[model samples]
Target chain A: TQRVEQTPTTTTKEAGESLTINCVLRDSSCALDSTYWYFTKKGATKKESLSNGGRYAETVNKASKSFSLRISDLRVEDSGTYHCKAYYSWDANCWNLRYSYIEGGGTILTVKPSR
Target chain B: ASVIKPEMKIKLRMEGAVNGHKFVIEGEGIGKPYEGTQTLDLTVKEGAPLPFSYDILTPAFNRAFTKYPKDIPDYFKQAFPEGYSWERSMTYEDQGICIATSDITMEGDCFFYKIRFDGTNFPPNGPVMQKKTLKWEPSTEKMYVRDGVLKGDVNMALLLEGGGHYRCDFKTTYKAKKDVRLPDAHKVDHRIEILSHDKDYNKVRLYEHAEARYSMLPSQ
Candidate 1:
């Protein structure tokens, strides 16, 4: 089976502190294209993609088998759970093609307002 | 750079009962026919990881010879006598894996051939044969029998030295009639072989060996 595992299942940080959520991948194809991060607010039902930019930055480390999301100048709105995933796609001789992906568990992050 | 037509030997054997009549059909044909090549590169997007080579061939084979457009081909239809028609056929889902299954259905029969690339031996290994047992329910149409057994085999030979070259041979056995009752189940012997004659690389050769059998006894 292919899946992802989030480390430090839960973490709390100050409003201005920095935090990183690490995603460990298992049984994934070697030629990975991209790893994406999604955010689900603490009490919201919607999940939003944290695609490049803003306070969120993502990196993929094949050496460590990890895909991580780093946050700078963390804010209260960043107080949400995150999910990480990797994608792989391929084409054979140009005629036959298919794609598959694996997702990791969620990491609940809580950002406390600075006193 | 060019389109080439490789010669092929399509030989098959089928035995089963249709509407209460038990009959056997068998024949072999050799020829150079159909489109042999296309100009298009398999494109992978999203910085995605490279897919395994077999991932490309399995579906290409499914489309070029097995499932796409139609199962088998027109020239081989002559093997079956009158009253019989090629109902439908499809390669099982999830290609690019060690095990693959393709389904071929006839007017009054059903056939599934499975192939598992052997892992016990070293590289350049042969395929392992497998059997599948199917039950056709009057309500849901078709369902696998817990006690029923079915097997299909797929052969693959890939040489990545010069760009890449792959050769696949498929064989299957199909059974006729629906197993309505446990006591009415039966097994019929069937075989379909497709031999590929690919001379060079870049030129894809699809559909090598295929066989379908109609068995009476439920797999034990």
Candidate 2:
């Protein structure tokens, strides 16, 4: 039951230019074994772990099912709008994770200042 | 000397659809008789959609996140990756429900829940849904939990009837003190016992009081 999709859900970047976003996970059957990623800003409420590879960039990439996020040198506090969530692990005990989100689609990175 | 003078108020409201987003948080406390409230209706379906939605009504603060645990921060260790254990027990069993034994090891991504009140038992009450940061270290009694890099499929039901004796703990990492406005933002700590009803008054009189409100939305 692993069906997570995120792409151009919405995006806009400019500041030093460097932004990539993509996440796709379809029927890996709740592909669990590992995956993590998360980042949030603006008055910052909580949720920060973007620097994956070891884990925590709101993780995803269960054998390259598809996962991508890269933002560097962007300011204006990095604008906002950027989200991709996915979690899998269907056995050990059971956790086909999903955090109900989808209201106003994200990807609105408008960081300017590299003229 | 400042002889204790604390007053607070909050109120927030939001309706649903966009996938789903519903909320309600109320509050009160002035001369003091005490009042509180909480209700959240979230729905962000279509492959986990949640990052941020607005409605922090403000007398102080209120919250809502149809999927804003930073968009899947580890989603709670990839949905409970054989890790979900917390300790701090003291039970007599009248229905306070505080148990700890450990050895479940994961199933349906390890599950358990509590954040029952949010008016200001003050320790740190924010972020719950896989948990990422919630700490209550009362001199090392222990209450620190983590799991929330982002992963919440939605299924939240919080209810607190009010009486006393309610304490919760969990936190991943939090450090605030740079300029405020969530400078180091990343927190989750909740503590309660507003008045302690002879040991939580038969479990908060079995619920049913009325008067719940919350507010904290005016920061742009």
Candidate 3:
């Protein structure tokens, strides 16, 4: 089931301002660590992740069924379409490994150079 | 003197996944299959009897450190003259699940496709955790058997680091022969009955190739 949805289809913020993008997993359960955050810059096809300890941080609240990414002091370079996803991994006959990723639609973020 | 050539009608049914999302492919004739089959379809030209081709590109990115400098293909060299990095370009994208650079050639009546799968794209003990390229190459040479049933053995080659310390194998319902080339860290296996084509029931003509896909799923 590749079903994950994000909120705030589009948003705008000043360079120094911060914003939070949210994701909802329609699957069985959502884990804090398993939820990964990615962003694709405008005019780019490669998806980049900010989950590895940067200005970007994530918090998963099962109570509200949300995985939220909060970025602080965002720069113009941070402007991009953001996504949250979890990878489903399984192996056949023990050694035949496979991976499938289910992600939220996307949240578009626009960061102006300054206020 | 040119009679209108009767169009060769083909039906291909396949089961595969994209980013782990499952989908079914079905169709009649050539060009492309049903709408929802994603990008899996075959083309059949008028005089070629069984004419077909397909292309699929996945949404995953290939980590730059997955393959060794020696293993990267020459074309990739042209694309990444500065070497692969965690940036935009053909260098970073995971070419797709089947790998976009696969070579399909026809030798006499044999149709063969040699496709490679990067181990980093798979999971559990995925290569991202190991920083090694456990690449797999499976090439199937398709030939028509009696009654139009296309059958062939898929030759698989596992390219690994040289150390003589690792041993790998597989088990399947069909016969599989393990042939290890000496002095090299490579294992070659010929798995039989992987592809069978039958025209009597067009619906089932392409059934086994999907099965072949599953059997080709490498363990380590």
What are the per-residue Cα lDDT tens digits for candidate 2 across B1-220?
A: 2111122221222122211223332222222112222222222222233211111111112111111233212212222223332222222101112222222122231122221112211112222222222121111111122332211111211221221111222211211112212211122222222232122111111111122111232245
Where does the lowest 10-residue lDDT sum fall in candidate 1 chain A? Answer: A90-99
Task: Name every residue pair that clashes in candidate 3.
Answer: A95-B219, A96-B219, B58-B96, B150-B197
Residues B1-220, model 3: lDDT tens digits? 2111112123333334433434343433221111111122332222222111111212111111111123222111122212221111112112212322222222322222332222223332322223232333333322213222212322232333431011122111111112211111112222212123334122222211111112232347
lDDT tens readout by residue for model 1, A1-84: 556778768999899898888888666444343466788887776767676678888888867678888899988888888888
When sorted by TM-score, best at the front, the candidate numbers are 1, 3, 2
DockQ of each: 0.02, 0.01, 0.02
Give the share of true interchain contacts found in each model: 0.00, 0.00, 0.00
In candidate 2, what are the lDDT values of residues A40-88, reduced to their tens digit?
Answer: 6655647554545332233445666666677666677777666665433
Candidate 1: interface RMSD equals 9.0
Q: Best candidate per lDDT, number?
A: 1
Off by over 4 Å in 3: A27-33, A61-66, A89-98, B1-220
Candidate 2 regions exceeding 4 Å error are A1-18, A23-29, A32-76, A79-85, A89-113, B1-116, B119-220
Better of 1 and 2 by DockQ: 1
Deviation from native of the Cα of residue B101 in model 3, angstroms = 18
